Amino acid sequence: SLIAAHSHITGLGLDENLQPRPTSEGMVGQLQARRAAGVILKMVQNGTIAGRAVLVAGPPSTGKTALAMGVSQSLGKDVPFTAIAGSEIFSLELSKTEALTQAFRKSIGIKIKEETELIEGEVVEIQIDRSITGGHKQGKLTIKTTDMETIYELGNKMIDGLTKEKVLAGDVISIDKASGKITKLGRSFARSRDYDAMGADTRFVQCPEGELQKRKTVVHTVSLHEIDVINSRTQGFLALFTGDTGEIRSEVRDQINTKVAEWKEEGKAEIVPGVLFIDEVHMLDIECFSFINRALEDEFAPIVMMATNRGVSKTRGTNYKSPHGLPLDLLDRSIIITTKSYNEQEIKTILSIRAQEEEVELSSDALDLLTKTGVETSLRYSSNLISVAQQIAMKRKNNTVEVEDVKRAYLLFLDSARSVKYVQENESQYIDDQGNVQISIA
Amino acid sequence: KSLSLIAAHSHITGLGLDENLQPRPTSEGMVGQLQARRAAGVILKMVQNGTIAGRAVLVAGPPSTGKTALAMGVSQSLGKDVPFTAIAGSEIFSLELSKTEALTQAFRKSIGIKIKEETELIEGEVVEIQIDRSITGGHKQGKLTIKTTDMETIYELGNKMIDGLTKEKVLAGDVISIDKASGKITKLGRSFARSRFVQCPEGELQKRKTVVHTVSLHEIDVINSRTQGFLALFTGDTGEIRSEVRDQINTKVAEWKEEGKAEIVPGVLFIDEVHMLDIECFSFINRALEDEFAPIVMMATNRGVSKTRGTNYKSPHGLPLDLLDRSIIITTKSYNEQEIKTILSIRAQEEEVELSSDALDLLTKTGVETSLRYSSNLISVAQQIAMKRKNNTVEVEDVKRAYLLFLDSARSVKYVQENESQYIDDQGNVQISIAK
Amino acid sequence: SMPSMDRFITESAKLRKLDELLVKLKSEGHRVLIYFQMTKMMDLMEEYLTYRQYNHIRLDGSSKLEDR
Amino acid sequence: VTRTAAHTHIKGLGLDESGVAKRVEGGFVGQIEAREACGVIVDLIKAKKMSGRAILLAGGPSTGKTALALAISQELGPKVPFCPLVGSELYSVEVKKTETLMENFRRAIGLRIKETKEVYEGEVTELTPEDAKTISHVIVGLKSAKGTKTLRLDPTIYESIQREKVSIGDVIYIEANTGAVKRVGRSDAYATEFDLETEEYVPLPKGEVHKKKEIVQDVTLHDLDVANARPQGGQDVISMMGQLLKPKKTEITEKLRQEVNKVVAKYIDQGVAELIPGVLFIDEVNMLDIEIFTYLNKALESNIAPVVVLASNRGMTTVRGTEDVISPHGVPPDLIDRLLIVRTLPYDKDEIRTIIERRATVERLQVESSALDLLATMGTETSLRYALQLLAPCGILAQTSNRKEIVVNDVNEAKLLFLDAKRSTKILETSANYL
Amino acid sequence: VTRTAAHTHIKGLGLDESGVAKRVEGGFVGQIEAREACGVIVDLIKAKKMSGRAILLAGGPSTGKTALALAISQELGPKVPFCPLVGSELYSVEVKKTETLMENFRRAIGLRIKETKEVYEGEVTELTPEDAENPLGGYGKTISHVIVGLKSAKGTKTLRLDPTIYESIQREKVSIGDVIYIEANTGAVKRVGRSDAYATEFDLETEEYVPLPKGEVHKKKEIVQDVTLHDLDVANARPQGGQDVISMMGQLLKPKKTEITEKLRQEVNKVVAKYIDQGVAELIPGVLFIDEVNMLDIEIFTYLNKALESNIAPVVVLASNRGMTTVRGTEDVISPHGVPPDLIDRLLIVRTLPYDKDEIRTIIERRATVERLQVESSALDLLATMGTETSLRYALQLLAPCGILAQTSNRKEIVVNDVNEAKLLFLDAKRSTKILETSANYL
DNA sequence: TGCACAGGATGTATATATCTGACACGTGCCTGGAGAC
């Protein structure tokens, strides 16, 4: 992929005692929040308790989404991490509670164990009997290895898998019984007489030896929401991609819960919980908070992580002000992690890490100037200036960003404060709140 | 039929009136409100005459003073076959129908059409069925012996009767009913032969039965509109029926009325909590009452000089003066202690609760102190406390225990107001910790 | 949905543990006798064996004297 | 017997041949100038030359506006289209309000078609198809009580015949122009072939086999617009169960309306059709949004727009959808510049008495003359509508005591039982808990 | 081993046979009067006579309102239906809130039906159709009959199938040698699997092998089903289950909620009353639970006023934690608990009380027992003092980070240092608000 | 002198296990009923 904003973070940077190293795994500073996030990560990996709400709060440009990305990178594969924004709940197709229920159920994974049989051999004879219209298909398949020789019976899906990537009586194929996958490994016979239509340029492999049929055990992870969408109607596997799953009824959900408990009892399946991350949680109505207050108390609930940057602001859907934009019912049943602002040394380390990520070589004086201008202005502006000064650096044909490149990039592009200063100086040229402007210069 | 546990108006069997439209002091489960009962009897005679249409009657009064009970008494005294549509005020705010369309569908469900037709049926007990079939089934010969308690016969069977008899498999001793024209055969069960269970029919085998159908105008509007079938009467997605089909139905009904093939019956549309309607609904109702195919509309409200919905001014009963000019108003009053005691006695006899006299006096005192509905609700939960200590009759201390356990409004308001720091106020400020 | 066979085996803990022991007993390649006390307790166990397609024969009170 | 509902004592404007209103004529009492203006408007509509003319009649509540509109509709006759409407009916949740306004505009332009109905019916006695796998034709011989008739038929009708499962001896119904085939049932002559049967048996038709009739079809332009713009497709003649996909209303384009106008203009020039413009009546016009008021200005300047009649009972009132626009009758002034306003005056005592006597005569009630003056005094004190609506409880209370004449005791009893708005408001003010 | 989430330490109300609540049993501590009132309500529900009764649970935040409703649901048992709702769930974009409220009202009335099925089953041995005279005649199907030969244990039958049954037979893709299952009530066919009388290891489609069915081919069996009235309503509204064209196309279209008319409900009520009168049905009314009732607006309250006065509606349990709050959808009315006074007049309010220090301490002790943690006595005293000082829920949710911090130090017990470190790492609402007050740029 | 409580004895309940016990079905055969005059 490309280079993103949080592409330099691989994990949380913790030792075996859950003590954060100062400069490791792309995360610097913020030791208390990193220790708390490691505690939350170990709580998730324990898998015992459910329905805990964690809130990350602080000023802007502090490392909140960086902390969530570090937690998701330390989580690893096969554990679902659903990351959504606050504005994605509002839809013209589903209600708010239905979208919240789907986002909750996307973060619970079910690990299902299956028994399969693998067949690898050389094809000898293929007989395919089809009706006149081509609908009803059946036939026999004679496959061999160097020791055995077996005749199998074919269904419709097997004939469809054979007539795609067409096997020509001497190819070495591999068939998975439980998955229905046919893979053409290559041709071993290398027949001379061939029709001049297809390529048939497959690689030369050997005929396999030994047992024709081998038993195997496979596992796979399927989310709960996938099972609800699949069992919702006839073509739910299409609705898993088209997103046309309109307001699944509650009876489907409780029958799925009963079947999941039955599968856990039988030893077939095991439940793997995950993390649901809601960035910018303050853009939610009070009805969404009221639904979350009851959805957190279920057994099938993931660890919900919320991030916000608001102070004492107005809760959406009401007419009063609350801390973090959240009502006190949600703040009572949630645990708060507080992030703190940086020094100049952490800013310098962040800028050095981001310059190393973008393959940009900086001089020491350029790094000091960027550190100073990231102390004065925001950190994100000095982070964004690096690639611009880099392109200016090959515009004068040297592969090292000097002080003059940073000065030119500071000259061409503006801050938040300088644009405010220019607008307040030349208010007559911009359209104000009442729609007044002065276009003519005479 | 008509399964029901116990309703809040289940003790009302109709208006208690004599032949001279005077109310008895206690009859058919209704106590008190003699002027309201007399006015409702006048409205009932207005409906039963059926010679005028489109009249609005408003029932207004304080809450929990016989408003919905009067409508239930009118509906029980109306009898069957006459339509009665009872909707709420907030039911017309749909998502796939406009408000005027929902009001039109509610209006046209209260006018019925009476059609009488006669059919022929063959009902009896099957004695013996003899079926002869070929190898290929090209031809089939059939003999059926059927009987009642008065006659015996044997029928030579055709092909389609044989195919309709092997489908819906009948044997000897069954009681079946056959329609000749449509070919529908209904198994009524088995006869009284032990060797569900239905007595054998008597009289003639081929009877001529006349049935009287009552079809609302809305059903004919749905059926005649070709966009949806008759299943829209059950699924409910009629979806904005046009006006030309309604005009055709009105002209055809007026054409059938002259030739004597059909009769018009009018009904009552009851709109409970009419103050929840919007101003545009009131403006549609102002013109919907001036039509020949309009029922008698009864509206109920308890608002006094409230804000009209959709406007910014206050109006009496929450209704604009144009609608109040077209209506006649029935006013209900509050109850004394004897009316409350009689109503509590009737509700005690309805729920099969045995009450002591002192418990009845305590319930009457706490009914005139707080509310009628609170004392009505206390009886069924006092009976469980009575049964818990293995006693049948409800005593005084059981009512006192139920008063101690379940709170009323006036005590709960005071308990909230003394401890306002523990609850969420209008500003979202609450205190959860006990100390400090 | 037809009554399943795996469920027939997982709702009884004794039958489940017997299946777990019999898997390694068959992997060892052995010979095994099982004693019972009820008619249907071996009638269902025959169904379990035919699910497992194991070679088995039965001797009980209803058996004739020649079969023994 | 007869149902009377707030009207139907109005049979017309009661004008003479010179357009001068008599005082008591056509069920109208008083209101000379408004009736004469409505007669002029009726003559203008019967002229059938102008398009998009709009009038508005304004006054107080219960003063005779809707009665005047229904009198206009009675004066024009039944062949002229008349679409009644309330202003709140334009807000639909399926299409925009401008589309509904254009639909109600095109619902008020009619057509007259001369047609001929030809019907064959009777018992089938011969069904001999002829080929040249494809049938060339089929010969059907019908039979009734007055004789037989032998007809040739194309195979298209033969496919409909074998759709209906028609054999020898069934009574059928064939329309010559449209090709409709209906099977009535088996004949009564074949009722004894079996003792028990599934077929139904009907007698022979007593009339002739061949019947002819002249009919006149009345359609509107909106019906043609609906019939040419079905979104899913066509439908069969018989469909007791609806479509699997629900067809909702759609925004019909201008191109379809232009093509419909072209086809109708071609059919008019051959003398087949006849164009009858009509009246679109909108009551309670103050319940319209400013957007519908703006689109009405465009719709009134078309070449096919009918005569529009509006009613309102507001004074200086803010327009709905705006904030600080005050205009008379709740109608914006740019629209007000396009109509003619007809004033409608209130009533004094004796006309109220005469109207009460008229409604008593229509409702088949006998009122004593002593009770009539008390009813008129009650009507002047409270409302005309309150006095009019109190006649039927008075009649029922008189009939209860075995009297066929209204006695003033019944009027006092009906006053005591049923209240008006003012006494109910006085109860509302002098009360403690929610009435 | 097991999953715990904010509950499941509660197994019931914990009463004796006289209805007197113990101080600590059944997972409950305190709240004696509320538990006794809920026991009276439980007996009223088990009486199965009343209809449209309602109670309201009023109290502060974190006092045990949802816990009492879950205890009622556990004391009733799984046979009695129980429909838990939140107040925000009634606003849907497919159908109006009135229909959703009526749907949840009808979803809480159960029914138990003894159902008789006519069943043909066996192993397919012969599958022979015969043709029509003119297949291209336009009207009528291609075939006329299908001869099916079924073999079961100790029996063998032959059937001449209708073509309409054969559409469902061939839609299941049966063949010779398959064990099938035909249900004569609806015409539905289930293909069980290949017969085990033939070979097994020569298949490639992971099929299931089944022995022959016992007994005769033609059977009649009795089946006890549990069905709510809402299930019958949505079955009749969207008909899937026949063999006709409409029932076949009903399974393929996208489902959508529709406004079910009252005529269908009256017909369903008539059929259910006939089933009860025949003696094959039993009616089980249930409980509908609406938590956070203050999220409803005035229109749903006004419809609920009508819906409680029907003769079918179940017992409704509400909950709220507002003192004197304006009702949503209004401007200036003020009512207790956000519930309008006309609805308040039909309720029975059950008051709920806050806890003390000792009750907080024993609740912390029991929840530490449930989560399988060992807590020292001084740490338990500090946790109880913290719960009195800040919140019960904050002291509840700090147990598991304390356990994690104890486990990272290679220990089993929880000591004071872990509680202090969890205090320093994790904050509550009051300290976060105090930080936000003394903040620089809206922290 | 009488009564109440506790301990022992015995009935029993319901699925077994052996285990007969008297019944209903799958093959020969020959002669007498059916077709023809």
Ligand SMILES: Nc1ncnc2c1ncn2[C@@H]1O[C@H](COP(=O)(O)OP(=O)(O)O)[C@@H](O)[C@H]1O
């Ligand atoms: N410790 C850190 N390690 C790596 N990147 C950081 C760190 N702290 C801050 N950042 C950078 O600062 C920005 C933090 O903003 P964001 O991720 O939106 O979270 P928040 O809004 O809570 O500050 C990110 O672009 C991230 O790259």
Ligand SMILES: Nc1ncnc2c1ncn2[C@@H]1O[C@H](COP(=O)(O)OP(=O)(O)O)[C@@H](O)[C@H]1O
């Ligand atoms: N006259 C009466 N006779 C019998 N029951 C009555 C009478 N008046 C009131 N009630 C009872 O009082 C209760 C409240 O009546 P209702 O009119 O439904 O309340 P509201 O006035 O709020 O509509 C009802 O359950 C009804 O049974």
Ligand SMILES: Nc1ncnc2c1ncn2[C@@H]1O[C@H](COP(=O)(O)OP(=O)(O)O)[C@@H](O)[C@H]1O
């Ligand atoms: N001149 C009249 N003669 C007879 N009846 C009249 C006359 N004017 C009005 N009415 C009656 O008075 C009532 C007024 O109703 P309507 O005209 O609908 O009120 P509005 O003018 O407010 O719409 C009608 O029922 C009508 O029959």
Ligand SMILES: Nc1ncnc2c1ncn2[C@@H]1O[C@H](COP(=O)(O)OP(=O)(O)O)[C@@H](O)[C@H]1O
């Ligand atoms: N009497 C009690 N005994 C044990 N735990 C309780 C008791 N009361 C409340 N709780 C706990 O307090 C928490 C909050 O109670 P709950 O009713 O869910 O929320 P609220 O009281 O805010 O409605 C629950 O997790 C519950 O386990």
